[PDB]
C-alpha cells in the first residue's frame, strides 16, 4: 500500500505535460525568440539540477 503510494507519488511528483492554446496576434517565432532568452526555462546543461 505505502510502497505503491511512494511510486505513484514519485510518478505524480514530476509531471511534464503539454498545453496548446491558439495565438491570434504576435508571431510564434518572435514568441520563440523572446522566450528562448528565458534560458533555464528547461534550456540548460545543469548536472544535479537535471534542468533538461
Amino acid at each position: 500500500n505505502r510502497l505503491v503510494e511512494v511510486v505513484r507519488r514519485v510518478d505524480k511528483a514530476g509531471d511534464q505535460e503539454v498545453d496548446i492554446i491558439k495565438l491570434k496576434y504576435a508571431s510564434a517565432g518572435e514568441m520563440v525568440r523572446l522566450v528562448t532568452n528565458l534560458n533555464k526555462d528547461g534550456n540548460s546543461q545543469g548536472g544535479n539540477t537535471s534542468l533538461l
Binding site: 496576434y25 508571431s27 518572435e30
Partner: protein
C-alpha cells in the same frame, strides 16, 4: 506571413488601395498671327535720257 505581419500588411494594403482621385485637365492653346508687307516702287525709262 506571420499573423503580426498579416495585420501590418492589411493596413499597408488598405492605405495603398485608396480610391485614386481623377483629374480633368483642360489645356487652352490660343495663337494669333498677322502682318503687313508693302511693296511700292516706281521706275522711269526714257529712250533719250536713260532708265531706272
Amino acid at each position: 506571413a506571420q499573423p503580426d505581419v498579416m495585420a501590418e500588411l492589411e493596413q499597408v494594403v488598405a492605405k495603398l488601395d485608396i480610391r485614386r482621385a481623377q483629374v480633368l485637365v483642360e489645356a487652352i492653346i490660343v495663337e494669333i498671327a498677322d502682318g503687313d508687307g508693302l511693296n511700292l516702287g516706281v521706275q522711269w525709262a526714257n529712250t533719250n535720257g536713260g532708265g531706272t
